[PDB]
Design a protein around this ligand. Structure first.
Ligand SMILES: *[C@@H]1O[C@H](CO)[C@@H](O[C@@H]2O[C@H](CO)[C@@H](O)[C@H](O)[C@H]2NC(C)=O)[C@H](O)[C@H]1NC(C)=O
Ligand SMILES: *[C@@H]1O[C@H](CO)[C@@H](O[C@@H]2O[C@H](CO)[C@@H](O)[C@H](O)[C@H]2NC(C)=O)[C@H](O)[C@H]1NC(C)=O
Ligand SMILES: CCCC(=O)OCC(COC(=O)CCC)OC(=O)CCC
Lengths: 317, 317
């Protein structure tokens, strides 16, 4: 694990701060914040209005979120600047108190990138609750890269990318704060996820790794969005947030929680939006930026992916 | 093109008939039928309730559709049996009058497979209006094949599949009835579609091949579902269905029709369902059957894909 100074941000603080929102509070003065990091093709509200913004509110938190533009499609390393800055702000703004981070898809990759390369926030996050995180990226994005129709962060979320290589070699496939990873074998966005083993993209060593089929059986189906929104996912997420270990506890959930429908406590209209989540995200991706190469690693990450290829060529020491 | 007898169906006619229905009519006695063939992961109503079922009704047709089970995920060759049987039935049931066929995604591949290998229906279809057809399959399905998480028809819709090989070697990449193909470069399901040329998966030789960006500009974005549901798609489809040439006519549409939102004449609720179309389809796909090989070609198609691999091995003469 890197153990030096935080790297400088490439974005100015005013830009990073403007990407951070808390519900009914300024980040500089917020009670019990939880930081929500959204998925590719979405803003914070788009990812979470139908699920963890109201659900975390009803668990006693002030939900906060970042919306790195455009729709989490740009450089995952810049998306992470938004998250690191947000943790620093919300830690201070809540009285120098650790806060939880809850993520969907790329948001989990972002959270682990921040914890890996910005050591100052390790003492500021008490837990990570990642839904369908793609720490290894996804094998499904390869053909899109080959056609040059991939946004910056989609290149970086392809299995074998320079970014996922650097994360792995820097130690980022092992949990850094107590982490729960809730994911599903029947994920049409992030693969591989089927083995219930370290091979899965959502798996972290020493994490609480919860593949839904391992608990609910092989016929249990929640997809990439269901991983975030289902009643089963809510019970695991609530367990992780409430737990004194910082990880969800097997005692808190079981076969009777294996409900694939959107969380019981959501309003009817939140359930509708939760079910449809992938459709607006897919449309935002298709309308967003596209390039023919993976964004360069920032200098702090380059030593961990020597020999991989990005826009400027082959990464050197 | 094959020019002999229709192959026998593998499914009983009672099963094929049970998969066909018409809005408010029996297929055996129907005025002005249009046969709608749905996309992968859907039934007829799921594909078209939000778009061409009401829209074709307002153009004066009786919409009819097939729902090959499960959700078009099984053998594309069996799905085509439903379509061929339906044309035979609707031709006779409308007084021995040719009828139009309108399709989404795999439905267009099915229509072209039927016209290629079942010569009896060529004189019974007066035109094909295909939205985002994948006659060449899609390059995006390869990684799912490699993980053995692909339904029968997803294997067959993979670029390079035995099925797509057989179709093109039998002559199926050239239109057989007057055909309009409406598709979009910004398709997240079917690729490649970006060239506005014969390389595109939706392209047929001698067809009316309408890539939306060629008409509406490089910044025009409709996705795989938008290709079916947009106001632009409605204007092109209306032109194709009314045209005395059997194909859409460039005189009937232009830049002022380049509205990417769901067709104007849809109800508010239909527009909502139209925009969300990919989400229930993706959910059905991940819940449906999966296998580790491409279904065998039926004997009538084997001579056209010698050397390709299916479940039983390498196709031979
Ligand atoms: C997404 O990322 C691109 C690439 O980093 C950003 O575009 C660059 O913006 C800087 C200044 O903001 C320019 O000097 C560069 O020339 C731009 N590069 C390209 C390739 O256009 C873009 O601003 C980012 N988008 C958002 C919404 O923040
Ligand atoms: C999808 O296709 C499979 C394979 O053809 C069908 O499975 C067959 O179904 C019946 C028994 O239920 C028999 O013809 C075969 O023994 C089955 N084959 C296999 C490999 O299981 C299946 O029924 C189809 N699904 C639907 C919904 O029609
Ligand atoms: C043969 C059908 C394949 C399928 O269904 O999955 C493809 C995904 C990928 O495409 C994207 O752009 C990812 C954006 C989330 O598309 C979706 O599933 C999202 C829409 C429900």
């Amino acid at each position: 694990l890197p153990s030096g100074s935080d790297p400088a941000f490439s974005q100015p603080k005013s830009v990073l701060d403007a990407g951070l929102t808390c519900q009914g509070a300024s980040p500089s003065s917020v009670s019990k914040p939880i930081l929500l990091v959204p998925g590719t093709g979405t803003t914070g509200p788009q990812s979470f209005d139908s699920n963890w913004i109201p659900l975390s509110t009803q668990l006693g938190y002030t939900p906060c979120w970042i919306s790195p533009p455009p729709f989490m499609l740009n450089d995952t390393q810049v998306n992470t600047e938004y998250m690191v800055n947000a943790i620093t702000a919300l830690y201070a703004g809540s009285g120098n108190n650790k806060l939880p981070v809850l993520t969907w898809s790329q948001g989990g990759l972002v959270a682990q990138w921040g914890l890996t390369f910005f050591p100052s926030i390790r003492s500021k996050v008490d837990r990570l609750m990642a839904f369908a995180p793609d720490y290894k990226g996804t094998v499904l994005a390869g053909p899109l890269d080959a056609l040059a129709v991939s946004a910056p962060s989609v290149w970086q979320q392809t299995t074998g990318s320079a970014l996922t290589t650097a994360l792995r070699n820097a130690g980022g496939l092992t949990q850094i704060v107590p982490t729960t990873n809730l994911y599903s074998a029947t994920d049409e966005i992030v693969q591989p996820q089927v083995s219930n083993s370290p091979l899965d993209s959502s798996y972290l060593f020493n994490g609480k790794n919860v593949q839904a089929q391992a608990v609910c059986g092989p016929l249990f189906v929640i997809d990439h969005a269901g991983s975030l929104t289902s009643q089963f996912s809510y019970v695991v997420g609530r367990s992780a947030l409430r737990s004194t270990t910082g990880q969800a506890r097997s005692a808190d959930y079981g076969i009777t929680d294996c409900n694939p429908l959107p969380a019981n406590d959501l309003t009817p209209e939140q359930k509708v939006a939760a079910a449809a989540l992938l459709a607006p995200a897919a449309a935002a991706i298709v309308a967003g930026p596209k390039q023919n190469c993976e964004p360069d690693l920032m200098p702090y990450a380059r030593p961990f992916a020597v020999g991989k290829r990005t826009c400027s060529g082959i990464v050197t020491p």
